[PDB]
Amino acid sequence: GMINVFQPTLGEAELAAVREVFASGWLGRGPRTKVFEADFAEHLGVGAEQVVSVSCCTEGLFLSMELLGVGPGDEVVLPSISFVGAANAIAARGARPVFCDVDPATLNPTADHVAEKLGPRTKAVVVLHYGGYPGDLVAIAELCRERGVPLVEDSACAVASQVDGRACGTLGDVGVWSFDAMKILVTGDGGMLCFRDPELAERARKLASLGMAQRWWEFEVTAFGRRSISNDVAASIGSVQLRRLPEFVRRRREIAERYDQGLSTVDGLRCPPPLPAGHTSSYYFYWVRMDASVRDAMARRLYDRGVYTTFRYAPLHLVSAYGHEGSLPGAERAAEETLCLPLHQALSDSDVETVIGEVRAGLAALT
Amino acid sequence: GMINVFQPTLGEAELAAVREVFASGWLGRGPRTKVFEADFAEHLGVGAEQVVSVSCCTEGLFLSMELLGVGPGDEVVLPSISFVGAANAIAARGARPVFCDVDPATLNPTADHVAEKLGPRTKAVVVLHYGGYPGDLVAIAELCRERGVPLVEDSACAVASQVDGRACGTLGDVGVWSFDAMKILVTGDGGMLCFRDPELAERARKLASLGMAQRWWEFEVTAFGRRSISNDVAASIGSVQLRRLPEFVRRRREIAERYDQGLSTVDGLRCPPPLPAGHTSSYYFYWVRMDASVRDAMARRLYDRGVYTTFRYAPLHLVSAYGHEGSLPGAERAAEETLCLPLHQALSDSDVETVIGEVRAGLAALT
């Protein structure tokens, strides 16, 4: 067979929610979207007026660069280890994405890494929480606050992560989540925005709805917006997935701890570093580090043995589309030494033991 | 109770498709999207290579304006009776939407209306098929062919409409469809693109996938694209809705014919003009025309009686965001005299008789 790196778990509970939406006859953005937004805001510890449901996280990232007003001559700092949609959201506006480095052991940037790229042109910072680890999020948010620079949190890895009881995505100025088929809370497709400023959230609702502002069929256009909204079919699924999310993360956590127990004695292999005090992870990735000369061979050997692996996220500063970038040794090293092992709540205990054994046997053969 | 103007019909067959997609664990773009594309392409009578699934019709409209390369200094002609997302797709690129008039009886533009707005800067023409009526589509396509101007068909009203056996959305250069909650073939949210040029379809697939192109996790970026794809959950619903589409249209057709029977000899009211020979409609709108002094009072009265009505599409040449426009008497008159009655395959015979009765009684009281 084949053990996947990512996998969602939707079933009869989610189907029953879809059934009610079909039977209601209202499948577009409606009462289910309001409920899911309020449910998610409670999950974050924010008001319901601060959260805006969108079609996907990429669209949320694009909208945030539009709302922040970035454009030609501006710069937006984000780690080279970022989702390609983040850099595209910057570049499509005419702004220049400026890539900072990361700690190769965590693939998260430190506050110093971010600060080394800030300048008079910086109009925003974008950061993710690699694998669910918040990283240096608190010091980064404090840095951007002192510099007067808006901080956008791409929280797609960290739907349930917290620092000292504060949900990731709420420490900066804008938070963006993904609910696509590869994440944890999964609605097929779907995204969420969270604005520290409620008035900026009100602009997002209008912009996501074609820039419209409303006999009752006439309207005005305040911006040439796209259609960036989700629907009640996805939202009703989201409320169910949100209730199951703690169970998902608990299962992902015990799998990760079993990985630690089975792989922490292996020479030439580094498991993920421990979570800092007061940090909780969503356990989105389980990344192992090895010598660069065997990382690719490991992935190919594991693929032949029925264990799929991959790497996230490809260093965007090596993508020539984004212009002349410099050297980023942390991201360059991680891109050569890191491999992501399967980690999701659909893994059986048999799959977990298969991954552990195939990784041990693979390393012994390549060393 | 309330009788709605638009309403989808999704039930057990659509649920069973969602169920097996949930069980497969592959919810993103996969084999079900390929099947739905192949199914829809056969429905249109075109090759599967020409068709590209997208997140929604608005996104398909924005993508087409991007692929065609419209920008500052360019102009795109479209009727004032167009969807707001079509005009936003033009103005967001820096191009100027140039609105043309429409026939007030059909709310569709003639080839003469489009020609009067063609000029040196015209880089594209966008047209829809109001209510499912193809209109002057053949002459419009021939005019754009003679002028060398690409023609984009917003076919959201005409998912099953044809002219002489040819599907609407396949006569111009690009066709776009909507599967949102208010259309006929409904997948919650969903879009479709059809290109006459297969190489342009290949560009659309890459642009819709964040502009990415081709160890296996590394990529290159050829365009700062958004994430504009659909998923296999929506696609599996689409294949079910597509098989049911002929039955939906037949039910909508017999409703409109019952409407014609009960409202034809009513003074002060004008039913839709008959379809031209060789034209078939999807029966998306049933629009009636009356004196402007009673149109608004009619909608207020019908609302109080439990019959929802509305008008599509608000004349965009009166929206101040799109710059200074002139007078378009046809669209202006249509916006004051037209009212759209409930028309969807969820209407029961009792609902249809309630609409006819309230319309006849309302016009008798207001005249």
Distance from CA of B262 to the nearest CA of A (A): 26
Top-tier CATH class for B1-244? alpha beta
Work out whether strand A279-280 and strand A162-163 pair parallel, antiparallel, or are unpaired. antiparallel
CB A117 within 8 Å of CB A77? yes
Residue of A nearest to B298 (CA): A215
Q: What is the DSSP letter of A69?
A: T
Residue of B nearest to A303 (CA): B216
Choose, out of A233, A236, A303, A319, the residue to mutate when testing the contact with B (most B CBs < 10 Å). A233
The amino acid present at B353, given as its one-letter code, is E
What are the phi and psi torsion angles at B108 (to 5°)?
Answer: -110, 150
Identify which of A277, A50, A82 has the alpha carbon closest to the alpha carbon of residue A172.
A50
3-class SS letters over A165-187: CEECCCCCCEEEEECCCCCCCCC
Place of tokens 């009067």: B116
Among A27, A58, A182, the residue with its CB nearest the CB of B186 is A27
Work out whether strand B338-341 and strand B286-289 pair parallel, antiparallel, or are unpaired. antiparallel
Identify which of A39, A9, A35, A7 has the alpha carbon closest to the alpha carbon of residue A20.
A35
Contacts of A28 in chain B (CB under 8 A): 180-182, 188
> Does an H or E element contain B38, and which?
helix B31-44
Contacts of A14 in chain B (CB under 8 A): 22
Residues across chain B: 367
Q: Please, how many CA atoms are within 13 Å of residue A168, restricted to the half-sphere of its CB? A: 29
Rounded CA-CA distance A233/A237 in Å is 7
Contacts of B226 in chain A (CB under 8 A): 58-59, 62, 85, 88-89, 92
Residue of B nearest to A229 (CA): B189
Question: Cβ–Cβ of B19/A19 closer than 8 Å?
Answer: no
Place of tokens 């799929």: A308
Distance from CA of A63 to the nearest CA of B (A): 11
Q: Please, how many CA atoms are within 13 Å of residue B338, restricted to the half-sphere of its CB? A: 27
Rg value, chain B, Cα: 21
CB atoms inside a 10 Å sphere around CB B61: 30
Is A18 an interface residue toward B (CB < 8 Å)? Answer: yes
Question: Cβ–Cβ of A19/B15 closer than 8 Å?
Answer: yes
Rounded CA-CA distance A154/A359 in Å is 31
Is A16 an interface residue toward B (CB < 8 Å)? Answer: no
Q: Please, how many CA atoms are within 13 Å of residue A59, restricted to the half-sphere of its CB? A: 31
**In a 3-state reduction of DSSP, which class is residue B112?**
helix
B residues 303-342 lying closer than 8 A (beta carbon) to A: 310-312, 314, 319-322
The amino acid present at B327, given as its one-letter code, is S
Is A244 an interface residue toward B (CB < 8 Å)? Answer: no
**In a 3-state reduction of DSSP, which class is residue A128?**
strand
Place of tokens 């006569």: B171
What are the phi and psi torsion angles at B191 (to 5°)?
Answer: -140, 170
Among A9, A27, A299, the residue with its CB nearest the CB of B215 is A299
| Token code pair at residue A104 | 């190769």
The residue extents of the domains of chain B are 1-244, 245-367
Distance from CA of B60 to the nearest CA of A (A): 10
Q: Which of B34, B123, B183, B206 is catalytic?
A: B183
Distance from CA of B246 to the nearest CA of A (A): 20
Identify which of A173, A168, A170, A127 has the alpha carbon closest to the alpha carbon of residue A149.
A173
Identify which of B40, B234, B204 has the alpha carbon closest to the alpha carbon of residue A180.
B234
Give CA torsion, residues A354, A355, A356, A359, to 10 deg: 120
| Token code pair at residue A357 | 């054994």
A residues 93-122 lying closer than 8 A (beta carbon) to B: none
Q: Please, how many CA atoms are within 13 Å of residue B36, restricted to the half-sphere of its CB? A: 30
Rounded CA-CA distance A182/B224 in Å is 22
Rounded CA-CA distance A338/A311 in Å is 7
Identify which of B159, B152, B158 has the alpha carbon closest to the alpha carbon of residue B135.
B158
Q: For residue B275, what are the contacts with CB-CB under 8 A and spacing of at least 6?
A: B133, B281
**In a 3-state reduction of DSSP, which class is residue A101?**
coil
Contacts of B180 in chain A (CB under 8 A): 28, 231
Rounded CA-CA distance B14/A236 in Å is 16
What is the residue-wise DSSP string for B191-218? EEEEESSHHHHHHHHHHHBTTEE--TT-
Q: What is the DSSP letter of A176?
A: E
Distance from CA of B344 to the nearest CA of A (A): 11
Residues across chain A: 367
Choose, out of A59, A107, A217, the residue to mutate when testing the contact with B (most B CBs < 10 Å). A217
Rounded CA-CA distance B189/B54 in Å is 10
User: What approach was used to elucidate this structure?
Assistant: X-ray
Active site residues of A: 183
Question: Quick one: residue B167, left, alpha or beta (phi over 0 = left, psi -120 to 50 = alpha)?
Answer: beta
Size of interface A-B (CB pairs under 8 A): 165
Helix then strand then coil, % of chain A, to nearest 5: 45, 15, 40
Distance from CA of B331 to the nearest CA of A (A): 14
Rounded CA-CA distance B21/A329 in Å is 42
Identify which of B303, B269, B261 has the alpha carbon closest to the alpha carbon of residue B288.
B269
Identify which of A29, A86, A94 has the alpha carbon closest to the alpha carbon of residue A55.
A29
Resolution, in Å, please?
2.2
CB atoms inside a 10 Å sphere around CB A148: 7
B residues 275-294 lying closer than 8 A (beta carbon) to A: none
Is B1 an interface residue toward A (CB < 8 Å)? Answer: no
CB A288 within 8 Å of CB A339? yes
Distance (Å) of CA A205 to CA A200, A222, A226, A352, B202: 9, 12, 11, 43, 33
Contacts of A178 in chain B (CB under 8 A): none
Q: What is the DSSP letter of B330?
A: H
**In a 3-state reduction of DSSP, which class is residue B340?**
strand
Identify which of B129, B135, B138 has the alpha carbon closest to the alpha carbon of residue B158.
B129
B251 burial level (CB within 10 Å; 0-12, 13-18, 19+): middle
